[PDB]
Amino acid sequence: IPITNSNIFDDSSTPYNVRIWHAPTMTEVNHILALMRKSTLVSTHSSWHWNVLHTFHYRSESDMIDHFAAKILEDWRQKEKLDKGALVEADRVIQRLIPLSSSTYVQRLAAIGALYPNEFTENVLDLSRLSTALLQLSDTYYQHANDQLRRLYRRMYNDSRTL
Amino acid sequence: KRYFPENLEQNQSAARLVSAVKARASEADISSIHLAIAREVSPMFNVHE
Amino acid sequence: MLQQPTGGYTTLEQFAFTIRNDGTNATPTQFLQLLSYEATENELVKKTIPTPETHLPSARNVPGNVYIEDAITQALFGISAQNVNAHGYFSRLSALALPNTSARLGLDGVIYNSETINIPFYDPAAVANFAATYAKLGNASTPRYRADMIDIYAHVGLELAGTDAERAAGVMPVKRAKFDSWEGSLISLSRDVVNWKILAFLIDLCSLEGEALRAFKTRNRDVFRMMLFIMSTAVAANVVNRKVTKRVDRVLEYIGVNSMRTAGRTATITYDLSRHEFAAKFLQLTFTRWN
Amino acid sequence: KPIIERQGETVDGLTIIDTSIVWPILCQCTYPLVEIVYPDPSTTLSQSLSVAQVLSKLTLPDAFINMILSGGDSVVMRTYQTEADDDLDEGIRMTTYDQYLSHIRERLHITNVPDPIYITGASTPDQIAASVQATHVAVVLYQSGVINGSASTYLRENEVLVVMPDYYDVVSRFANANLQMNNNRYHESVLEIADIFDQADFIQTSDAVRQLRALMPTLSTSQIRHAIERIAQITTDYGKLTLRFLGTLTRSLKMQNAQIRRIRPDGTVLRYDDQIDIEAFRWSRYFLDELRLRRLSVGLRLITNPRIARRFDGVRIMYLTDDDPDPD
Amino acid sequence: LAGANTIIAIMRLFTPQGFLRTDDLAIAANFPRASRNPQTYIPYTNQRGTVTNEFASRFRTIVATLANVVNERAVQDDMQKATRSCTKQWLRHLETQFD
Amino acid sequence: ISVARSMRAIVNHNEVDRPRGAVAPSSYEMDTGTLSRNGDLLYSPVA
Numbered sequence: 018i019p020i021t022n023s024n025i026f027d028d029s030s031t032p033y034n035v036r037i038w039h040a041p042t043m044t045e046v047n048h049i050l051a052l053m054r055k056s057t058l059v060s061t062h063s064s065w066h067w068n069v070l071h072t073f074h075y076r077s078e079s080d081m082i083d084h085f086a087a088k089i090l091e092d093w094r095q096k097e098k099l100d101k102g103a104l105v106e107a108d109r110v111i112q113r114l115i116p117l118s119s120s121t122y123v124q125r126l127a128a129i130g131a132l133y134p135n136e137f138t139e140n141v142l143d144l145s146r147l148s149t150a151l152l153q154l155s156d157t158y159y160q161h162a163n164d165q166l167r168r169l170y171r172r173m174y175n176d177s178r179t180l
Numbered sequence: 181k182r183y184f185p186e187n188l189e190q191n192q193s194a195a196r197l198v199s200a201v202k203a204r205a206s207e208a209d210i211s212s213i214h215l216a217i218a219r220e221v222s223p224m225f226n227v228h229e
Numbered sequence: 230m231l232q233q234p235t236g237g238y239t240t241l242e243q244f245a246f247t248i249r250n251d252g253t254n255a256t257p258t259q260f261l262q263l264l265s266y267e268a269t270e271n272e273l274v275k276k277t278i279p280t281p282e283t284h285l286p287s288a289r290n291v292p293g294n295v296y297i298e299d300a301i302t303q304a305l306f307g308i309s310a311q312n313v314n315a316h317g318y319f320s321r322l323s324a325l326a327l328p329n330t331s332a333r334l335g336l337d338g339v340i341y342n343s344e345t346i347n348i349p350f351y352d353p354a355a356v357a358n359f360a361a362t363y364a365k366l367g368n369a370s371t372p373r374y375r376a377d378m379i380d381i382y383a384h385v386g387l388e389l390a391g392t393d394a395e396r397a398a399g400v401m402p403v404k405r406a407k408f409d410s411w412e413g414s415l416i417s418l419s420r421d422v423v424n425w426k427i428l429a430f431l432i433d434l435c436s437l438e439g440e441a442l443r444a445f446k447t448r449n450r451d452v453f454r455m456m457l458f459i460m461s462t463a464v465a466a467n468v469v470n471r472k473v474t475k476r477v478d479r480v481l482e483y484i485g486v487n488s489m490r491t492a493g494r495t496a497t498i499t500y501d502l503s504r505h506e507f508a509a510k511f512l513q514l515t516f517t518r519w520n
Numbered sequence: 521k522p523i524i525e526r527q528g529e530t531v532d533g534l535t536i537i538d539t540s541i542v543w544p545i546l547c548q549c550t551y552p553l554v555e556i557v558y559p560d561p562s563t564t565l566s567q568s569l570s571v572a573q574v575l576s577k578l579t580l581p582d583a584f585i586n587m588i589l590s591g592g593d594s595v596v597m598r599t600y601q602t603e604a605d606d607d608l609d610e611g612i613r614m615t616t617y618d619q620y621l622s623h624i625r626e627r628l629h630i631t632n633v634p635d636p637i638y639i640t641g642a643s644t645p646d647q648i649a650a651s652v653q654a655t656h657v658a659v660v661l662y663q664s665g666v667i668n669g670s671a672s673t674y675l676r677e678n679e680v681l682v683v684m685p686d687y688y689d690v691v692s693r694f695a696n697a698n699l700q701m702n703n704n705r706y707h708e709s710v711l712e713i714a715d716i717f718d719q720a721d722f723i724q725t726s727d728a729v730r731q732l733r734a735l736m737p738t739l740s741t742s743q744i745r746h747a748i749e750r751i752a753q754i755t756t757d758y759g760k761l762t763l764r765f766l767g768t769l770t771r772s773l774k775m776q777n778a779q780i781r782r783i784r785p786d787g788t789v790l791r792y793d794d795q796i797d798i799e800a801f802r803w804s805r806y807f808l809d810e811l812r813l814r815r816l817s818v819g820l821r822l823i824t825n826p827r828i829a830r831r832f833d834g835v836r837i838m839y840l841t842d843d844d845p846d847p848d
Numbered sequence: 849l850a851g852a853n854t855i856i857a858i859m860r861l862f863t864p865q866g867f868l869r870t871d872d873l874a875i876a877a878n879f880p881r882a883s884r885n886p887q888t889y890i891p892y893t894n895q896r897g898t899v900t901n902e903f904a905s906r907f908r909t910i911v912a913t914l915a916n917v918v919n920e921r922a923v924q925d926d927m928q929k930a931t932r933s934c935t936k937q938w939l940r941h942l943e944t945q946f947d
Numbered sequence: 948i949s950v951a952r953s954m955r956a957i958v959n960h961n962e963v964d965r966p967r968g969a970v971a972p973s974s975y976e977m978d979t980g981t982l983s984r985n986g987d988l989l990y991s992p993v994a
Contacts, residue, residue: 041373042373044375044376045372045373047377047379048372048375051378054489055489055795055799057796118795119795120795120796168270172270172271172272175271176271184938184941184942186937186938186940188527188528189528191528191934193528193930193931193933193934194528194934196927196928196931197935197938201938221888267653269654299984302985303985306985307985308985308986412726413817419985420983420985421986423984423985423986424985424986469631469656469720470718471656472658474677474679480656490799492720493720494720494721494803494805495720495805496720496721497720526933527937528934528937593900594896594905596896596897596902622905622908623905710896736898738895738897738898738899739899740895740901741904772944774944774947786919787916787919826950827950827951829950830951847949848948848949
């Protein structure tokens with residue numbers, strides 16, 4: 018199924034298209050996710066809606082990092098309340114997307130988000146251009162890693178397949 | 181002759197590049213070739229340029 | 230009509246697993262000493278292994294007799310290119326799983342319908358338990374049954390290259406294993422380990438009891454760490470060989486982490502898509518029995 | 521040579537696109553609608569297996585000689601004999617940064633190799649070891665502030681040739697016990713690409729082919745060209761009609777260790793990526809077949825057996841006359 | 849230079865290849881030389897490997913770096929941009945003829 | 948010289964047994980070993 022962009026008058030072409038596989042049992046999921054390697058650029062995330070696995074399919078590489086960041090942002094938040102202790106309504110537990118077959122930027126972008134580096138804020142975080150401003154923070158976090166921190170961030174970069 | 185072709189030239193886009201190499205071609209004169217190999221070792225008295 | 234004294238068919242000289250290298254023939258134990266390894270920092274942690282499903286496939290009626298043994302090895306360590314094999318007479322095994330059956334399993338590696346004249350076969354009572362576990366290998370490519378071709382490999386690398394100091398904690402650092410070689414190497418061990426009589430081993434695992442299972446696992450934890458090494462180079466990402474002055478080393482990229490396509494191509498043994506499902510179904514089934 | 525390229529060529533108006541062809545489609549032509557015919561698959565499937573069979577046996581001889589060769593070559597380095605001259609080959613060898621930029625740097629991008637590092641000076645006698653580990657080949661870069669005698673002794677049996685950007689003088693960048701190092705007492709020879717790599721299907725490596733290659737009379741580009749030429753005539757097809765229609769009357773592309781890669785938007789050959797590139801484009805296998813590469817393995821044993829080699833070298837002249845007819 | 853490093857790099861492509869040799873078969877036979885010391889250039893050695901020929905490869909490197917200067921020159925025209933492409937069918941053809 | 952050998956002088960001597968430099972066939976030119984399932988050629992056990 019093709020997803021439409023948020024606005025009604027923004028009649029442009031869609032960034033990505035979502036896909037729904039037939040998969041009942043557990044030993045099934047393991048098949049689609051493994052066969053899902055060696056295939057352009059695709060993404061899944063942690064849990065699922067209706068209990069049926071559904072992956073994302075991006076058009077052009079560039080139009081991946083701008084969606085992959087729009088989610089990593091709204092998940093640094095769900096772990097703000099779950100860190101202080103509060104009955105959170107929203108469901109997925111971990112919103113952060115998972116890069117299956119993917120490029121190279123999304124790697125350096127996947128690891129930086131996984132280990133929750135940000136602190137609080139709440140100053141009407143700019144929704145547009147959030148992509149690059151987050152990717153800039155990724156680099157400078159590395160220019161500080163005291164061996165031990167470096168060791169891990171260089172691993173999740175090199176791995177990038179497990180949440 | 182066989183300088184610049186790789187062939188399939190004479191073309192419309194090549195037309196400019198074709199004439200540039202053509203107005204640079206030296207003719208295979210037996211004596212002119214020998215004079216280049218000989219000037220390499222022979223002593224001179226006039227400052228040629 | 231051989232029998233086991235609870236020493237097992239492996240406590241016999243009839244069939245013994247020996248690799249040929251070094252200009253003479255040697256036992257697996259002598260070989261493995263050459264495998265020296267370091268670390269590259271990607272932690273390969275031991276997961277849990279999910280139990281298999283009890284349902285046994287049906288051995289569709291078949292006249293004649295297939296070499297059940299052949300295929301078991303011809304898939305795992307098969308060297309010569311093996312085409313799709315997800316299909317086949319691969320479950321005639323289950324026809325031995327029931328109590329009173331006449332179908333017998335000979336030596337050499339065949340499955341006769343009726344015991345015939347002049348053919349030595351394993352004991353009809355201890356071949357029953359071997360089936361109620363391995364006939365389950367019939368459904369290896371049925372959707373909703375196949376094992377997972379990723380996590381088991383973590384289990385595999387902790388076996389042939391895991392110093393005990395590590396396994397006792399369940400976690401180890403990804404290793405890069407290099408031994409010293411000769412010519413064909415990796416391909417030569419395959420053409421070698423293929424004809425080994427694997428059935429002469431697996432039968433022992435499902436019968437021999439605690440007395441002669443603790444003693445069995447001690448003398449054979451090496452015949453296992455041999456048919457586990459070759460089965461591993463069919464997965465590794467690289468096979469590039471380092472050079473000394475006159476010496477040659479067969480560095481293997483990442484033992485214990487599973488990729489999807491062979492580093493060998495031409496240099497080593499190669500798997501196929503239909504075989505990736507198969508190796509996961511074997512490796513999963515066997516580990517529960519072993520460990 | 522790029523695939524999709526607008527070079528000066530026409531396939532006879534098949535490169536010349538033309539509009540104005542839309543007018544017959546609307547007001548001239550008639551269609552079957554306003555019984556249908558379905559074409560047989562066998563007649564179009566036959567044309568494919570033909571134009572695909574002609575292609576394989578076309579470049580077959582070409583790729584073969586380019587495999588027995590390609591073993592390795594060149595890279596002129598000098599080894600500085602250190603010690604009380606108890607050697608003609610010590611091991612402290614080195615080349616220029618110049619020779620390295622046209623022979624070693626290209627092969628190190630076909631195989632995805634991290635670096636290699638820089639010696640620099642005051643570097644540990646295991647930093648060379650730490651690099652060569654993930655490099656697969658022995659090589660380190662340059663030297664600035666003269667290195668210690670601890671590291672200097674290491675790069676001798678481990679070879680690991682050090683590339684120098686300069687060559688004016690070398691005995692300024694080593695601290696030593698003072699024997700043979702004086703910009704002299706060095707013998708300069710040639711190295712091998714058949715030595716400093718030997719990957720799986722990348723570079724041909726075997727003592728059966730190594731011994732074979734060390735016999736020929738120093739080939740040029742013309743000697744090796746007439747080689748992949750005499751081997752052509754030494755060995756209706758709907759395809760023979762097309763083998764002629766084709767431009768077989770050229771084929772001038774030096775394909776030593778030819779590989780399939782994708783230049784960026786402009787012109788910089790990318791490293792073999794993973795997710796974006798397909799599978800087969802990893803290695804070349806010298807463009808030979810999978811089964812035909814395995815037959816080569818058994819044939820490489822016949823070509824080196826003690827009984828086939830019947831050419832003998834050296835004959836000693838003497839006058840012993842007296843006969844006892846001996847075949848030996 | 850600090851900023852003209854690219855002009856110095858494209859310029860050094862004129863450096864000679866061969867060694868200089870002190871000719872002896874003239875001074876050993878007492879031929880009159882102006883000099884004070886009999887010397888000369890060569891000017892480009894000979895074959896050293898089996899199938900390398902470094903002189904041919906040195907030229908290949910020139911063609912490689914001299915290609916980027918042409919494949920960068922931003923032209924303000926249209927067909928003069930089409931002549932920028934049909935120049936490599938001369939820049940590369942010529943390098944093959946050299947080997 | 949003479950690497951292609953096998954055997955020589957297939958005649959028996961006037962009065963003695965072996966006629967000097969006589970070679971007997973190699974013990975390998977006369978051994979059919981069965982083929983393996985994966986690999987394809989090998990000799991006999993010897994023990």
